[PDB]
Design an enzyme around this catalytic site. Structure first.
Site, mmCIF file in Angstrom:
data_model
loop_
_atom_site.group_PDB
_atom_site.id
_atom_site.type_symbol
_atom_site.label_atom_id
_atom_site.label_comp_id
_atom_site.label_asym_id
_atom_site.label_seq_id
_atom_site.Cartn_x
_atom_site.Cartn_y
_atom_site.Cartn_z
ATOM 1 N N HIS A 18 0.813 -1.221 0.000
ATOM 2 C CA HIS A 18 0.000 0.000 0.000
ATOM 3 C C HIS A 18 0.849 1.276 0.000
ATOM 4 C CE1 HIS A 18 -0.175 -0.414 4.526
ATOM 5 N NE2 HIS A 18 0.154 0.874 4.434
ATOM 6 N N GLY A 78 2.114 5.833 9.870
ATOM 7 C CA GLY A 78 3.547 5.930 9.614
ATOM 8 C C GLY A 78 4.314 4.743 10.165
ATOM 9 N N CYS A 108 3.536 1.585 9.435
ATOM 10 C CA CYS A 108 3.391 0.461 8.519
ATOM 11 C C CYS A 108 4.737 0.020 8.032
ATOM 12 C CB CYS A 108 2.449 0.794 7.368
ATOM 13 S SG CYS A 108 0.744 1.112 7.888
#
Ligand SMILES: O=C(Cc1cccnc1)Nc1cccc(O[C@H]2CC(=O)N2)c1
Ligand SMILES: O=C(Cc1cccnc1)Nc1cccc(O[C@H]2CC(=O)N2)c1
Lengths: 304, 304
Positions: free
Chosen positions: A41, A143, A145
């Site tokens: 993503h 942030g 991830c």
């Protein structure tokens, strides 16, 4: 003595944390050898997240569109590919800090350490468990991830989790290092809900053994039970059914303390039916299920 | 979102952990530059611990009697000295892994991470607080002496604790890196008892702010109180008296949430007087006091 929610030393994993930026989006990546693993993503915009077609989105992405930074040095991306929900960015420099590693898919009930990261930089480390409903109750902000879950054996790091998303209920979903989500979660900004979160019975038993080892013996009673009778009480309280495999894994804890597993089950049955009456176990006013029987022996024997 | 007892990444501290052996005794040492700091009870035998005269015991010790090992390599000890309750072993090789460091003496209420070690090897990391009674509620076994407590700012490690002993009550006592014990504890195998352990009120308030930020808002009530009235209720429950300095430090948390400090105090007063009624806050059935207001902002803002 003393019993704490201990995490593995994070040094071997800090050496792998990198920053991956694609367009406007920045998240964490895991640099092992000449590959940087990160959530796919990263190629999405806020509009794309609603219903993303990752193959189509990746077709508009080239090697140079992925900015990888390790500290203050930019790494040259020479290849990119999608493996399920992770992007693998092949870099021209192998990580000199690469520890011995395995990619492993853990079972629910099992525990691991999380090194929460922002911009490729570690902020903190804590212990987690893979919930029976395949979510984790972590501490993650936007942030984080790409932050990884891991275990350590001697010198070998087994990477088991990569953080991808937070559900509206505040729980966290993610993948193994092959990009496969744990549970039914999809990396799409759609309303997803975690199922019933049951209590990891074998871990609560292991932590009752840890309490006995440490001096907390109040909950010990003059009673016993059978596996089937205990499971009738586990069922009512949304506890995982106890199997003979669980009794087996509790064997070394049972052997050390001298308390039979079914005896501890009777003590647990009473804790479930009667509550704690204002008292505590290991400084906790509730039954803790995030220590496996392996975590208990390791902490009560100083396994480095 | 999510709130966990997070510890600092331990990599900078793992690089400093060494094994120090004196005669039959092995414990951990901290290698920063060309000095190895370790508890001075390393020169003792089990008989010496009853009533040790450390100056007399050190007189029978020479540079070569202290075996220092960093991984699998032996370090040459060229000097030795006693600073309060720590031995400083000067080695001929400076630690190439020495991070930026400070030696700091923390106040009770303040928190820090512990890297528990056995034989100079890290086994795990967890967050702790210096209790108001100057003990720590850690997880330590025999052989963990020399394990350090630390905080991290950017790239600078502030060493604040070195583990020395366990009291019969299961709590842990230790020193700052200048060898000075926190509290009235002496490194002698004599019956020592920790005083009354009070609850760090400002930390419980900070964690109530963290719960509000995270969605747990049930405990919020339609009431307020004054500092003096709240302290009457804090006194009864062995809570630390709240001062205007504490209210000040809670200021950024109060500003972010929009809940006045005295309003949160009224909510806390009710939690003390009425209990939690079977409900939980941040997945805890008791009032947590091991998060400072700094820990809350750091975790709720992703400070790396
Ligand atoms: O959640 C994050 C970032 C983040 C923020 C706070 C904590 N941890 C992660 N991203 C994301 C990625 C892929 C799908 C997605 O949709 C959400 C809707 C749902 O149920 N899942 C969200
Ligand atoms: O406790 C340990 C080792 C250890 C074991 C388990 C956990 N952590 C440390 N050593 C030691 C050192 C100096 C005095 C001493 O006396 C005790 C009697 C008392 O109150 N203090 C004991």
């Amino acid at each position: 003595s003393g019993f704490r929610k201990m995490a593995f030393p994070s040094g071997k994993v800090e050496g792998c944390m990198v920053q991956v930026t694609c367009g406007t989006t920045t998240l964490n990546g895991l640099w092992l050898d000449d590959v940087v693993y990160c959530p796919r993503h990263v190629i999405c915009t806020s509009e794309d997240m609603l219903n993303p077609n990752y193959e189509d989105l990746l077709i508009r992405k080239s090697n140079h569109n992925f900015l990888v930074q390790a500290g203050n040095v930019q790494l040259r991306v020479i290849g990119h590919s999608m493996q399920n929900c992770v992007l693998k960015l092949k870099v021209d420099t192998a990580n000199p800090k690469t520890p011995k590693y395995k990619f492993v898919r853990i079972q629910p009930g099992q525990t691991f350490s999380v090194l929460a990261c922002y911009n490729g930089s570690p902020s903190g480390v804590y212990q987690c468990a893979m919930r029976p409903n395949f979510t984790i109750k972590g501490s993650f902000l936007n942030g984080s991830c790409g932050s990884v879950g891991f275990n350590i054996d001697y010198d070998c790091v087994s990477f088991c989790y990569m953080h991808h998303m937070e559900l509206p209920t505040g729980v966290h979903a993610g993948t193994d290092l092959e990009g496969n989500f744990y549970g039914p979660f999809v990396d799409r900004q759609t309303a997803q809900a975690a199922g019933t979160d049951t209590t990891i019975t074998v871990n609560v038993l292991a932590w009752l053994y840890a309490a006995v080892i440490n001096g907390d013996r109040w909950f010990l009673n003059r009673f016993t039970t059978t596996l089937n009778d205990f499971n009738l009480v586990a069922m009512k309280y949304n506890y995982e059914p106890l199997t003979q495999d669980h009794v087996d894994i509790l064997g070394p804890l049972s052997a050390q303390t001298g308390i039979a597993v079914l005896d501890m089950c009777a003590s647990l049955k009473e804790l479930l039916q009667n509550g704690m009456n204002g008292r505590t176990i290991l400084g906790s006013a509730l039954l803790e299920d995030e220590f496996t029987p392996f975590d208990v022996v390791r902490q009560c024997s100083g396994v480095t």
